[PDB]
Design an enzyme around this catalytic site. Structure first.
Site, short mmCIF file in Angstrom:
data_model
loop_
_atom_site.label_atom_id
_atom_site.label_comp_id
_atom_site.label_asym_id
_atom_site.label_seq_id
_atom_site.Cartn_x
_atom_site.Cartn_y
_atom_site.Cartn_z
N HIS A 314 0.82 -1.21 0.00
CA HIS A 314 0.00 0.00 0.00
C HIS A 314 0.86 1.27 0.00
CE1 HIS A 314 -3.39 2.63 0.83
NE2 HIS A 314 -2.79 3.08 1.91
N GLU A 315 1.85 1.30 0.89
CA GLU A 315 2.73 2.46 1.05
C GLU A 315 3.72 2.60 -0.11
OE1 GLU A 315 2.23 4.83 3.38
OE2 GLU A 315 0.51 3.66 3.99
#
Ligand SMILES: *[C@@H]1O[C@H](CO)[C@@H](O[C@@H]2O[C@H](CO)[C@@H](O[C@H]3O[C@H](CO)[C@@H](O)[C@H](O)[C@@H]3O)[C@H](O)[C@H]2NC(C)=O)[C@H](O)[C@H]1NC(C)=O
Ligand SMILES: *[C@@H]1O[C@H](CO)[C@@H](O[C@@H]2O[C@H](CO)[C@@H](O)[C@H](O)[C@H]2NC(C)=O)[C@H](O)[C@H]1NC(C)=O
Ligand code: NAG
Ligand code: NAG
Ligand code: NAG
Ligand code: NAG
Ligand code: NAG
Ligand code: NAG
Ligand code: NAG
Length: 871
Positions: A314-315
């Site tokens: 996600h990051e």
């Protein structure tokens, strides 16, 4: 219209003016981790456009003490400015002695100081526990959306991008990290060291970051020469291995997928102990909760592995979606957050297909539908203004609904055309900003009778709620209406451009029809038993089969269920139970559909179905509805005996295999099945007797601890073991186990510690309260506490932080009586101090009334249906 010391304040909007644009920040910060404060200076290379008497920019809780303006034409080193401060817009105004001249570059310099942050915002202090029991301070940033201004004055809107050169002074015992790698470390007269960081790329202020700590790393290089390092506490370096491995594989993927190299030499992932969000995408220095990143195979489980992988992906996706291409303003936060969530799917499917993450992605989309089916839901993209209403944009709508509606569009355009469209989106707006429409033009164009994708998405993005598709099948012709789906009716406004996907008994070929109207017809090329719209549930709508259509699909499940796709099934189970809440189907239809599950081995479907039956048990247990709960206990233990008894108290098998184990052994132990309690009780007793030595498999770790916590000896030893633990994941599981005590003083103790914040970190308080409130023995306790300590809570967090939203929601939304609805109403009105208002007051009320209605309309059906079985 203005304060502080004295007079009028030039600029009146809370948005900054367009007239003066920062190009570059030199920024020196000198933190002190014994004093717990800092001194700092900056030099902002700015470019004027229109002539002006006043520079305006953001600053908050900063003492500014010197403010000079130099130039290169004009006025060489250098003139002094007067500072007006206006806290109500978090602005300061720099008054100049001369109408500045268009098209010329000036330099704004200020010295400024402040105490280190006390909370989870701006430049704040965090602590951690060493294996020896030492407590150690670090300083860290979190600026999203608008707390960059709490650390250094700046043009803190994400459209005002600039380059950042950070310098940081430090004691020898600390390191300093920031976005960029460290060019040099110069020693100073008094023994202190100063670190110089490569100048950043053009980027938004909310992503600027810096840290001072004594952490140790593990490092590795991607095929493209990027130095990934995983920073964590010193005694936790063993736990950084998986995060390194995964991030490496993931950055390789993302680089290729986007066809855009990661621009920086390094990317650091650091595991901060006191961290409010799950993680933060600070370019080159991504901050994570220890549970979002660390992994210890002695104690983390399949699910944790799946979670860490998911947040890392996600990051890392944010590095392109957000940092490389930033949204113009916070109204369109989803373009970043939604896409990042979607790319978890694409990326984790590619790098870690063994994790079977795409079956779990359905779960996340369904759990959205549940909240998105109320009146008081909101669009993924609505306008935003005040410091509160921007913080309101941070939840699951702008996020998961985002990701699902994107996942729909992959299916409608295909992986290859979708990919090409976002490759151009990313390249066209690299180091720059983009609106909603900029994304859609990029996805449509990739001659020429048009993809008019804008029109399709205007209705999924800027419009509230979710469509219901009703289908009638009179022989060979299909009637199709659409409606807004609500959880209590018998809606006068809405209409979607909803792509559709049907399959039949005749052939398993997917045919596609679109639609842009309230009503439409389509005849099938065959007479056939059933139709199944929304294949694999890759669309974001709900299907209702009026006429005999539902009954066919249920008789299909009981006969030969493998003629429906394994994702088609989870979709039907989901949709049925939701349509009961809608009052379109009756509960016995739904419960009859659960009969086939003794033959289901696709754990996606099996877990989904069980979740509804377990959900009902807990509704009944919290109200004291003994006769139904005791029957529903017995039904779940006899039906589903075969699959429960087939479960090893082990870590063996696949990921879904392990998740099914954890589920079913939890259910059995939650319903007091004496064999499961006695096994669990043994594993715990051996463990405590050996003093941590024996090894409970990670997939039964919660179950064993929670059972162990029923005795007073076990609860006290578990709380002790909590404080000593070096796995934040084990700690998490121990906190759950402690919060399943029946003793009221014990549950309160946990809350009091979480307030105190030393033993149980304050960042865990919301989840802890919800854990307590879920259970019958703590639902009152938790409720009383939240009312009686509202002021006391609101020092620790601001409203509307995610933390405060989940304290309100988590202690109230499970209520399902007319009494408790009134109590919550009363409490919500009471908060017309500054308190009123938040969106979550409404959605909780609507959630409680939904539960009121569901019970009145369906409870006698649940009672009789269970009694039909027992015969
Ligand atoms: C933040 O503040 C700290 C004090 O609260 C400071 O620690 C102190 O640092 C100095 C040396 O750098 C020490 O004093 C030394 O120098 C004088 C001569 O000027 C001698 O008389 C002393 O013998 C000694 O050599 C202090 O002892 C020291 N305090 C402690 C307890 O460590 C930090 O340096 C500051 N941190 C930063 C990075 O700014
Ligand atoms: C601020 O960031 C920009 C990039 O956003 C930097 O511009 C780069 O400059 C080098 C040397 O001129 C070029 O080779 C690159 O093409 C530029 N980057 C890209 C991809 O456009 C710039 O160096 C930075 N400015 C300052 C003040 O250092
Ligand atoms: C600056 O200049 C342009 C005219 O070229 C004008 O349209 C713009 O509004 C000016 N800025 C302000 C707000 O004075
Ligand atoms: C502001 O403080 C600085 C500290 O670096 C000092 O050097 C300077 O003299 C001050 N400004 C003026 C105009 O005196
Ligand atoms: C992890 O274990 C290795 C070998 O067993 C050991 O050398 C190291 O000290 C451990 N690391 C941590 C941070 O516990
Ligand atoms: C899942 O991954 C594989 C490639 O590893 C691919 O064949 C399949 O299409 C992927 N599905 C999605 C949803 O991208
Ligand atoms: C939905 O419910 C109430 C009553 O029908 C209505 O007043 C309210 O405006 C609706 N929700 C919102 C926030 O629009
Ligand atoms: C179910 O249908 C499949 C597909 O034809 C077949 O292979 C299997 O033998 C059938 N089993 C049952 C329970 O009828
Ligand atoms: C709730 O449970 C208690 C303890 O079993 C029982 O005595 C009581 O009847 C229940 N409450 C009501 C009003 O049914």
């Amino acid at each position: 219209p203005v304060a502080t010391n004295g007079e009028r304040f030039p600029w009146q909007e809370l948005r900054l003016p367009s007239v003066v644009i920062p190009l570059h920040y030199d920024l020196f910060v000198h933190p002190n981790l014994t004093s717990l404060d800092f001194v700092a200076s900056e030099k902002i290379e700015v470019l004027v456009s229109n002539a002006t008497q006043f520079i305006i920019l953001h600053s908050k809780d900063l003492e500014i003490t010197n403010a000079t303006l130099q130039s290169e034409e004009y006025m060489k080193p250098g003139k002094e400015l007067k500072v007006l401060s206006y806290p109500a817009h978090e602005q300061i105004a720099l008054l100049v002695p001369e109408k500045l001249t268009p098209h010329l570059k000036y330099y704004v310099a200020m010295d400024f100081q402040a105490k280190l942050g006390d909370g989870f915002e701006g430049f704040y202090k965090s602590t951690y526990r060493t294996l020896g029991g030492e407590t150690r301070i670090l300083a860290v940033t979190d600026f999203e959306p608008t707390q960059a201004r709490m650390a250094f004055p700046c043009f803190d809107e994400p459209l005002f991008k600039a380059n950042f050169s950070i310098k940081i002074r430090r004691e020898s015992r600390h390191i300093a990290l920031s976005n960029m790698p460290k060019v040099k470390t110069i020693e100073l007269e008094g023994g202190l060291l100063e670190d110089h960081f490569e100048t950043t790329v053009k980027m938004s202020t909310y992503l600027v970051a810096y840290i001072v700590c004594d952490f140790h790393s593990l490092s590795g290089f991607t095929s493209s020469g990027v130095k990934v390092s995983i920073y964590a506490s010193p005694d936790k370096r063993n736990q950084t291995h998986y995060a390194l491995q995964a991030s490496l594989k993931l950055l390789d993927f993302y680089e290729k997928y986007f066809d855009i190299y990661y621009p920086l030499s390094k990317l650091d992932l650091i595991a901060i102990p006191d961290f409010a969000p799950g993680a933060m995408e600070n370019w080159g220095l991504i901050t994570y909760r220890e549970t979002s990143l660390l992994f210890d195979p002695k104690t983390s489980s399949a699910s944790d592995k799946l979670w860490v992988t998911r947040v890392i992906a996600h990051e890392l996706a944010h590095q392109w979606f957000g940092n490389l291409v930033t949204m113009e303003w916070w109204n369109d936060i989803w373009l970043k957050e939604g896409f990042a969530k979607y790319m978890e799917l694409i990326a984790v499917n590619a790098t870690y297909p063994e994790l079977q993450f795409d079956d779990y992605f359905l779960n996340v989309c369904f759990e959205v539908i549940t909240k998105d089916s109320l009146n008081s839901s909101r669009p993924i993209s609505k306008p935003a203004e005040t410091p509160t209403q921007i913080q309101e944009m941070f939840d699951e709508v702008s996020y998961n609904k985002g990701a699902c509606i994107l996942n729909m569009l992959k299916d409608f355009l295909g992986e290859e055309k979708f990919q090409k469209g976002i490759i151009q989106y990313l390249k066209k707006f690299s180091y720059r900003n983009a609106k909603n429409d900029d994304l859609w033009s990029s996805l449509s164009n990739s001659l020429g009778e048009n993809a008019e994708v804008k029109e399709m998405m205007t209705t999924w993005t800027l419009q509230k709620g979710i469509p219901l598709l009703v289908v009638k099948q009179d022989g060979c012709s299909l009637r199709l209406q659409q409606e807004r789906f609500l959880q209590g009716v018998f809606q006068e406004r809405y209409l979607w451009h909803i792509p559709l996907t049907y399959s039949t008994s005749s052939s398993n070929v997917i045919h596609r029809h679109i639609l842009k109207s309230k009503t439409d017809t389509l005849d099938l090329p065959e007479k056939t038993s059933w139709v199944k719209f929304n294949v694999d549930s890759n669309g974001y709508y709900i299907v209702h089969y009026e006429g005999h259509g539902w009954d066919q699909l249920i008789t299909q499940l009981n006969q030969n269920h493998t003629l429906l796709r394994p994702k088609d099934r989870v979709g039907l189970i989901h949709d049925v139970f939701q349509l009961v809440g809608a009052g379109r189907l009756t509960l016995d239809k739904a419960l009859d559909m659960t009969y086939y599950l003794q033959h289901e081995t696709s754990s996606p479907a099996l877990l989904e179905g069980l979740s509804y039956l377990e959900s009902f048990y807990h509704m009944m247990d919290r109200r004291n509805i003994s006769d139904i709960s005791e029957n529903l206990k017995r039904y779940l233990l006899q039906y589903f005996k075969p699959v429960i008894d087939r479960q090893s108290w082990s870590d063996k098998g696949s990921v879904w295999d392990r998740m099914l184990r954890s589920a079913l052994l939890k259910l059995a132990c939650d319903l007091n099945h004496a064999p499961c309690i006695q096994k669990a009780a043994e594993l715990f007793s051996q463990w405590m007797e050996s003093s941590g030595k024996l090894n409970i498999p990670t997939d039964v770790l919660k179950i064993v601890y929670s059972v162990g916590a029923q005795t007073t000896a076990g609860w006290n030893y578990l709380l002790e073991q909590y404080e000593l633990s070096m796995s934040s994941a084990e700690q998490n599981k121990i906190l759950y186990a402690l919060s399943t005590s029946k003793h009221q003083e014990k549950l309160l103790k946990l809350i009091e510690l979480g307030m105190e914040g030393k033993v149980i970190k304050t960042q865990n308080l919301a989840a802890l309260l919800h854990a307590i409130a879920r259970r019958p023995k703590g639902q009152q306790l938790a409720w009383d506490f939240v009312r009686e300590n509202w002021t006391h809570l609101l020092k620790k967090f601001d409203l509307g932080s995610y933390d405060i939203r989940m304290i309100i929601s988590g202690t109230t939304a499970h209520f399902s009586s007319k009494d408790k609805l009134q109590e919550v109403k009363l409490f919500f009105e009471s908060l017309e101090a500054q308190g009123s208002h938040l969106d979550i007051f409404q959605t909780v009320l609507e959630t409680i009334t939904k539960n009121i209605k569901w019970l009145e309309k369906n409870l006698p059906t649940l009672r009789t249906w269970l009694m039909v079985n027992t015969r």
